[PDB]
Design a protein around this ligand. Structure first.
Ligand SMILES: CCCCCCCCCCCCCCCCCC(=O)OC[C@H](COP(=O)(O)OCCN)OC(=O)CCCCCCCCCCCCCCCCC
Ligand SMILES: O[C@@H](CNC1[C@H]2CNC[C@H]12)COc1cc(Cl)cc(Cl)c1
Lengths: 1034, 200, 100, 50, 50, 50, 50
């Protein structure tokens, strides 16, 4: 095929043009994101029971919904939380590769058949089934700088005006309002209600009667009278529209004729459906929208479109309304992608420079400058074909494969030049000969690299999804590189290279390029001499090889593992947790302290703070808060002290002085769709109906046992809330009957006053909004306030709660957890330094095996996936080794020569390990993929050396030692220029310290070390291996 | 305004009509709930009476020849035609008195749209029309959008249905031609190992 | 019994607010009549899998379902693949005039 | 000449065929009843059948 | 999957019209074979359970 | 696969049964499937030997 | 077993094996539906079936 295209350069150019056009089209049309879909598909069922405690929600909603989650395919597991805020969240996690839409529709359909079994209030509030997620593409905050708008005002404005157009913007998948539209709020006065002998039941009945839609009929409807000429619809009672209409609602008429209206017994206003969450931006009231990227959409294009829409919106805003961007990681995504693109461009430029340095021929340097961009464009086209996106993993895969691409181009062009300068053949004949020397080796290398890289695409789980990106990218790039080296590069070599004399090697040249040529000639002579000397004494170096292998194993068994380096993305988080029972105001005090610290002590680094009072993560409530800290541009934050790690450490140390509040600042994970580390997620399961207290005792026992193992387990804690004091009311129904008081009236009064009641809907400015009746805050704060509430009896007398009720204090769970339909407790931990996660899990299982009877356990999250996918990667990489050996045997037509190639694997790996050990890096994903690419390049070099030696031995009469020496002499230069080009190209990644430096250093350090060691060692170990193997088996 | 402008071009557009209904009169009814309470008549009774009489009410199912079918109660037509016909309709009070509607109700006339259309989430009105004889739908579309450009600010336009597809086809034709020419050029260049043959 | 304005405010807008973010959607058109009828037709790009499109719009419609009036919920909100043209019309008449 | 002819050639989507059927839409003023629409429909039917 | 989805989309229109007692017991929509894959029995060898 | 998953779930459940409770399989055709397919594979190997 | 259970006068008792594939069942059997297409009722349909 190389011979076919040497005589048909125009056909090769046409193929290259087609590849370039496909690559350009793919680049234009490809999605762009930071990461692909890594986490397994999950669906969340969210329901709310206003006024209900955790136990009420669990018993009336959570268990009923969980008992009906059957007949759903590919479900991995199910977990659920029920909170004292009245909310239940059920997460159903499905197997990887499950269709998210089908899973969601199946879950929602199974819920639809359970809706009749739920409480009417929960049905009225609505149960939502959504695709589980923990990240937003963007957060658009809206603030008021005048103080004339409250949080509810801004939320209603955003809902009515901003939300719809943003939702309609291209690429937006979902929009979440940081608040709610207005709700009619009826804040009740128990004293005024008592004055008129009224209760919340009367108020609710009146609001339902006087705010309703009533069907009337039609004038002249069908079937009509014979002569009817006019037809008109009859309009009747419709929903109210204003607070004024609600205030005029009539509640009763007195004997003296006076009218009691809703305005008389309650304050009427517009407010929020809920008041649990308070959002502030630099201390100012804030609302906003969390915007999620749509499937297959460009992140950058979607963000730009949203910004353009907001810019078009701003002119119509009320005075004082401002748009802000509290959480914006899009700049980090942009800078990371641009850094990778610059790395590719610099790699191409450095390949050009190295080619000119060695060959000193502009036309020769031009050939790789065409070959490599063509392969990159084809790789983009292939990624588009397979439905991949331009994310961090794929671009770093391209960065890692650039070494193999430049190696292919350099091999072809350098071999043609060497043939031209040794035999003096013209470019066409020289290209034919050189291609005939390397075509079979190129095909064999393609097969070997396929075997090396394909298995990454068959790992299981989220880590499998991560590895598949690199696998597909590198495999496609390698295959296209080989195809281009067999089609386009030979044609360019035969068409563009100028002839070289028989003996012209640059010896007679003047200037720098004469000295360099002479020095390289002498260096090659010395290298060949030393290789012969080594070959005379092979065993001495076999001992050194054994030393290298032993040291490689020693370094490998001592390198810490990880998943992805933490990155400085320009944002981070602070969590505040207050003692049980703490109120919204105390949490706001702590959050104000945090915001002041960030905006005063770190004014040079922190640009803004978005403080959310009401929820953190792993719970929600009045005693929890989260502050989202945004940093200035990395250009404005120079030095180590001004990066996220140092800033967060300083913030944690400063916040350690805050009393009665656990405040911790920390950085985001590399992939925020999952919360992952070298940790484990453990579930303690009630398997025999033991109860909450016995499960708490078992959890405490397990926690103490784990605490007795400091050297194996670290930070083994519960991911939940402890029991909190609760106020228990016992309504003696017998006494209520004796007093002529209905229990329904008692329950309605208490719940509506202290919990709030959603009554019905009204229409404000053409939009449907909710109507809530709740007591005025003044009368629902303390237990004694219960003495201010009365219920009317059948006799008409108004009875106080003290007449038919008693009260006390007990303890109860503010947050109840279930796992797979049983009561559960979640424990988070991690292995101590120097310990694998597998052995930490083993110790946790051993500790749990001694728990009280009826208590089981389970693994969830990443622990579940680790347990499920065990010893899989080594298995199919043993398969890969077998396939590589078979491919090499077929290439060489020998059962033994393959070994001399495979023995090269350690020579590179050692260096990578060294580079990872001295720099203090871990065995993360980037390190492993870089190690694979280094192994591939080393195998390429060894394969070419062995092929040249064997061809000399067979196609010529040359002996073993002479053939090996000539092969290494002929292969020294291309190996050296490839290594130099790749090392110079990855220099910036090793040296980088800016945005994205974690991933860049992870990719670069291992590649640098492996390339250096492989280049140094292989050039005199591959001949040794070949000679030893041929001497033993001949 | 747009319809009048289109009607000013009889030689280019024909049957230019709105695909919708015009605003209709409506009979607004107000039931004085306080007055009804004073007379002892429940509001639910009033609502049920008016709705069942004038619009009809579905009660429950029955079986006709083994098939489940609906049961409807409705006023006879002659007591359901004009507004004054509520003179015969009474609602019983708690004490057994038959209170007429006039005692607790009033009415007025209003105007309202009987059919509201929205396109891509925004209020909209659909217009249908044909090209005049000897003209093509492309010319009619060009004239229609030229006319639409001369409308009050805040009013835009769009093409839907077959018009959307026609605009799409017209938009994508030139790129189709260009890509086809490029593909043929490259195929010839590869097949005949020349650039001169493809260029000629 | 709901007028076009009230059914638009309580039904049509509520549903169509949640109809954003569906794949391969070309356009959306809704009408709200004086009998309380709401018809929302969503047209997708040619070659779109109609079953997947229906599943997606159903997943989005479930979010609006609890926000609709209880009467609308009791009547039932139907989501189904739709066509705008009759395949054929089969009329039935009586040749004796005995049946109305 | 080819460029000039292409620009001046009117565009469309698909030719209209005689499919053996067609439609007639009737719309009366606002408030018109069933029987008035029936009279107009009867007039249309009489025109088509005569 | 699509068959079950369409069947339930049609069934949710009838669900409101069903008797409240039927709704409280729970309507089920399944896509399974008509024959038992297996039968898993449970006994008490000690005779301490009915 | 479903039978294997069911058996694994039952194995998870077993450690928490009350005293005396025991699982039995009065109706399971999977053993027949396994033995039949194994017999056919044995036939293939015997055919190779012959 | 069927021969033995033919002596039970209290009930019809039948012991049987399953086919290779249950759904295909008998190789010569037919399944027939008698439909009441005109609202005849249960009695008339039963008479027609007899
Ligand atoms: C030319 C030929 C080249 C072919 C490719 C060479 C093989 C790959 C070289 C290693 C690159 C991958 C590096 C890596 O990820 O290794 C670590 C990983 C698990 O270790 P980790 O969780 O990172 O923990 C480290 C301990 N602190 O994995 C490991 O610990 C290593 C697992 C073994 C690697 C495969 C080679 C050995 C195969 C036999 C393994 C035995 C078990 C499987 C038996 C299957 C039998 C069919
Ligand atoms: O205000 C909080 C959400 N508001 C919730 C309540 C009020 N009702 C329902 C809504 C803001 O949360 C976030 C803010 C940022 Cl900047 C970044 C992330 Cl990841 C999350």
């Amino acid at each position: 095929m190389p011979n076919f295209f040497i005589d048909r350069p125009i056909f090769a150019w046409v193929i290259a043009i087609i590849i370039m056009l496909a690559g350009g089209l793919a680049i234009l049309k490809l999605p762009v994101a930071q990461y692909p879909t890594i986490a397994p598909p999950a669906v969340t069922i969210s329901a709310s029971y206003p006024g209900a405690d955790a136990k009420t929600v669990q018993d009336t909603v959570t268990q009923v919904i969980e008992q009906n989650m059957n007949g759903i395919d590919n479900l991995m597991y199910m977990s659920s939380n029920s909170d004292s805020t009245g909310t239940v969240q059920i997460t159903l996690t499905f197997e990887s590769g499950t269709d998210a839409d089908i899973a969601q529709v199946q879950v929602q359909n199974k819920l639809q058949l359970a809706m009749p079994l739920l409480p009417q209030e929960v049905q009225q509030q609505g149960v939502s089934v959504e695709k589980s997620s923990s990240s937003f593409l963007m957060v658009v905050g809206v603030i008021n700088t005048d103080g004339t708008m409250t949080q509810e005002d801004i939320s209603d404005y955003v809902a009515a005006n901003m939300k719809d157009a943003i939702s309609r913007t291209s690429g937006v998948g979902d929009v979440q309002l940081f608040g709610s539209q207005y709700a009619m709020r009826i804040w009740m006065n128990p004293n005024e209600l008592n004055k008129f002998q009224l209760t919340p039941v009367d108020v609710i009945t009146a609001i339902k009667a006087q705010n309703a839609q009533v069907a009337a009929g039609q004038l002249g409807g069908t079937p009509p009278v014979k002569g009817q000429q006019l037809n008109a619809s009859i309009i009747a009672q419709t929903r109210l529209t204003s607070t004024e209409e609600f205030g005029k609602i009539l509640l009763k008429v007195n004997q003296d004729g006076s009218r009691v209206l809703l305005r008389d017994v309650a304050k009427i206003e517009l407010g929020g459906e809920n008041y649990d969450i308070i959002a502030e931006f630099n201390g100012q009231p804030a609302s906003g929208l969390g915007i999620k990227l749509a499937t297959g959409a460009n992140a950058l294009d979607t963000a730009a479109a949203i910004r353009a829409e907001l810019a078009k919106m701003e002119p119509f805003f009320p005075s004082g309304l401002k748009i802000v961007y509290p959480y914006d990681t899009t700049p980090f995504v942009k800078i990371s992608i641009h850094e990778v693109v610059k790395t590719l461009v610099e790699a191409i430029i450095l390949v050009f420079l190295v080619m000119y340095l060695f060959l000193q021929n502009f036309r020769a340097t031009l050939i790789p400058t065409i070959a490599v961009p063509v392969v990159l464009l084809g790789t983009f086209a292939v990624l588009a074909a397979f439905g991949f996106s331009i994310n961090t993993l794929t671009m770093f895969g391209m960065v890692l494969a650039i070494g193999l691409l430049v190696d292919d181009a350099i091999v072809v062009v350098e071999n043609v030049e060497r043939v031209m300068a040794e035999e003096g053949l013209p470019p066409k004949e020289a290209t034919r000969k050189s291609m005939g020397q390397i075509q079979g080796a190129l095909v064999g290398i393609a097969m070997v690299l396929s075997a090396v890289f394909v298995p990454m695409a068959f790992f299981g789980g989220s880590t499998g999804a991560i590895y598949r990106q690199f696998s597909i990218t590198i495999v496609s790039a390698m295959a296209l590189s080989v195809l281009v080296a067999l089609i386009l590069t030979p044609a360019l070599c035969a068409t563009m290279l100028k002839p070289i004399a028989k003996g012209d090697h640059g010896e007679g040249k003047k200037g720098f390029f004469g000295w360099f040529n002479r020095m390289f000639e002498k260096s090659t002579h010395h290298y060949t001499d030393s290789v012969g000397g080594i070959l005379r004494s092979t065993g001495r170096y076999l001992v050194l090889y054994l030393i290298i292998v032993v040291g490689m194993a020693y370094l490998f068994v001592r390198l810490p593992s990880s998943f992805l380096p933490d990155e400085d993305q320009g944002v981070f988080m602070t969590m505040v947790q207050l003692p049980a029972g703490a109120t919204q105001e105390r949490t706001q005090k702590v959050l104000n302290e945090v915001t002041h610290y960030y905006l005063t002590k770190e004014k040079n680094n922190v640009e803004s703070v978005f403080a959310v009072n009401g929820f953190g993560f792993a719970g929600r409530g009045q005693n929890t808060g989260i502050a989202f800290v945004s940093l200035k541009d990395w250009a404005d934050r120079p030095g180590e002290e001004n990066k996220v790690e140092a800033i967060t450490m300083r913030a944690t140390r400063a916040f350690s002085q805050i009393k009665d509040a656990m405040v911790f600042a920390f950085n985001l994970p590399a992939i925020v769709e999952l919360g992952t580390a070298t940790g484990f997620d453990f579930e303690l399961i009630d398997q025999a109906g033991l109860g909450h207290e016995k499960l708490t005792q078992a959890r405490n026992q397990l926690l103490a046992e784990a605490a007795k193992h400091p050297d194996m387990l670290t930070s083994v804690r519960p991911n939940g809330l402890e029991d909190t004091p609760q106020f228990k009311i016992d309504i003696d129904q017998e006494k209520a009957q004796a007093l002529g008081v209905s229990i329904n009236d008692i329950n309605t009064t208490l719940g509506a006053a202290w919990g709030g009641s959603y009554v019905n809907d009204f229409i404000d400015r053409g939009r449907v909004k909710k109507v809530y009746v709740m007591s005025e805050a003044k009368y629902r704060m303390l237990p004694d306030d219960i003495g201010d509430w009365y219920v009317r009896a059948a006799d008409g007398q108004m009875v106080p709660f003290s007449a038919f009720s008693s009260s006390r204090w007990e303890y109860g769970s503010p947050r109840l957890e279930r796992y797979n339909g049983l009561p559960s407790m979640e424990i988070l931990g991690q292995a101590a330094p120097g310990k694998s996660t597998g052995e930490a899990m083993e110790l946790m299982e051993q500790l749990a095996s001694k728990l009280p009877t009826g208590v089981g356990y389970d693994w969830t999250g990443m622990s579940y996936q680790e347990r499920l996918s065990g010893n899989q990667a080594p298995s199919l990489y043993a398969i890969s080794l077998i396939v590589v050996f078979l491919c090499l045997a077929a290439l060489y037509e020998s059962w033994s020569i393959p070994f001399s190639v495979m023995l090269v694997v350690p020579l590179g790996v050692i260096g990578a390990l060294l580079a990872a050990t001295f720099r203090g890096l871990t065995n993360d994903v980037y390190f492993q993929v870089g190690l694979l690419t280094t192994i591939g390049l080393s195998a390429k070099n060894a394969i070419l050396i062995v092929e040249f030696a064997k061809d000399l031995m067979d196609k010529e009469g040359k002996g073993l030692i002479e053939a090996t020496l000539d092969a290494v002499r002929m292969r020294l230069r291309p190996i050296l220029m490839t290594s130099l080009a790749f090392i110079l190209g990855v220099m910036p990644l090793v040296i980088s310290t800016g945005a994205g430096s974690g991933a860049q250093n992870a990719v670069g350090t291992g590649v640098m070390g492996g390339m250096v060691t492989a280049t140094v060692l292989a050039i005199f170990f591959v001949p040794v291996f070949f000679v030893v193997v041929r001497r033993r088996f001949s």
